[PDB]
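Q: Structure for this?
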Amino acid sequence: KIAVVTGATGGMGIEIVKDLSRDHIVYALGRNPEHLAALAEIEGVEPIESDIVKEVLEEGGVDKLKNLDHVDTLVHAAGSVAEWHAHLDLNVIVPAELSRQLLPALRAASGCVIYINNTIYAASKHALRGLADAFRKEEANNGIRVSTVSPGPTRPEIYIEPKEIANAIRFVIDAGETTQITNVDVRPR
Amino acid sequence: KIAVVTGATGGMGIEIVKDLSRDHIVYALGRNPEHLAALAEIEGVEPIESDIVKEVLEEGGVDKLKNLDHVDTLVHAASVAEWHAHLDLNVIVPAELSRQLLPALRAASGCVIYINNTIYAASKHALRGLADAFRKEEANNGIRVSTVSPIEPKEIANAIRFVIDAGETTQITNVDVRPRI
Amino acid sequence: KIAVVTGATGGMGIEIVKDLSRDHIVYALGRNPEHLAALAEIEGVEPIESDIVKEVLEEGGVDKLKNLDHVDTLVHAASVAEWHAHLDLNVIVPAELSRQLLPALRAASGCVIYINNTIYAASKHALRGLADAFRKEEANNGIRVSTVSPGIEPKEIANAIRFVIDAGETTQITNVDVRP
Amino acid sequence: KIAVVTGATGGMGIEIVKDLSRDHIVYALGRNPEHLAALAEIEGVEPIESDIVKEVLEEGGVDKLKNLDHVDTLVHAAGSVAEWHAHLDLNVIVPAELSRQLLPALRAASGCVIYINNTIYAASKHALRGLADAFRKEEANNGIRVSTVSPGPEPKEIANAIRFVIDAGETTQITNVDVRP
């Protein structure tokens, strides 16, 4: 089975790549070159060094993902004005447009798309959430499952072990066929 | 570990008891005596035949639950007259049954899981308010509160198993389960 | 125009009945006989002493409302023991009173407006779930449903109610969040 | 009083501008040069030709608004990567930045900001709402009121809702109004 994971070199993505590599060849898109090397030590992990906003939004797609004709699992773990653009580009537009570019392969595999969800932070997380829900409704008939795993504070969210996010992802994709786990709310203890 | 499950002879309840019995002694409260007998053949399963409204609301407690000093997991899976039936069973019973088990839950720092027409709407929102507010009240007392908001019965048991398997630093406060389409 | 207001003798009720009396005959339900007497002084206001839980729920009706041929505006402003009282009064009564007046509401294409600790959370969400579902059930039958969700001078609530029912021909105001 | 209204030449904008001109001088931003002249025929309306994304986002302010030391009422009424950028720029980033830029004038007047609320359309309407609700919390202590008008499945009726919002009592805020056909 085929998995694509963005933010693969962040704390969460590393744990997500290790989990999915049990039963998927994983395309792990990431920024950190040492983690990427470390990741390629895992069998069936295909590291892709990538500046994701530039590749997804400016160049029309990540070349090394272009040949995939079935994707089973796609996990999106990647002044003020410049700050708005940076956040919205990376947290909302890239998941939407990367999912669109992989759409044919997602339909073909009946895959699962999982999103990991100040004024700018509130807006983009509320944005990402409306994207997820409307996408889900657009694609349910095509066999695509859409899910949001939502970390947040109880205290602050950084105290969530990243492996628990990987487990949340594993729980979502493992759900039986008559089911969609559409949302999982995650908080520190 | 000690688990208390209501609605234990419903489809959901049966699969929840089968799964929780892997690592818990399970006090299974339900209506159907034959399923109760069946469940009792599961190592550790304590069947309690119960009319839950009456015992919990009027009698002030379920008898076979009174000498427990630890509860690690409590799962609530159990027209004017209809309103009274729904609201009594969907809301007050979970509120009141949690209250009565509060000491054993704090002592265990345990987990409370609530499995979520016009009566149907108000009860499900009512259950959701109860849970989120009970979470706030018992946050500092070491009790964790979780909703499963739903479908194949085992998928519910899986969701419960995922909730309580959370590590030492995390909790799963809600899981939405929907039909495929 | 005909109007029915519960908890009409509480702070909000009083102001709601005054404003509504400008263009409505108002049937004002209360238990304060002195405020009820007081209210009756206003033209167009016809007061009704009622033990509303007992009447709506246990006797299936409030007698003095039974004969109305339409209701243009209905406004709902009226421990285990604590669970029962609040749920009875905050949720079941508006559900049941509303059902009981269904034929008058349908006749007028009227407006139903609901004014929205563990108990307090639960009933306030129950009330909101009721209103939304009720809205969907009756949308096709001419009835408009609204909530006022105050999280305040009662006159402000009355103004919120007035703003809702006076809304244009093409528009419904389905919810208004009011804060201190 | 002083009002700033974006999208003044749009169908909503015109009726919001008319209603506000009763008790405000209205800075009415738009691109339509004929409708701007049309509106200029309403006394108390000082129209302002503008490419608002460019001026607010690139240039760091709308010129003809830089003099304002008080603003009472600010009203924001203005499937490809490019579509995403167009919509989110206009509907989210503009309102946050414009509000930020007028933040000194708004604090001085203790004024109110009103936001008038397909994968792109869901994402931006949720974004604006999240923008508005965090903004409100940020500025509550500084005396600014924040309100949303959330249309759903006649422009004058939007103008009326806005009038309802700004006219609220001394002790009361109207934070949100859900509107439907």
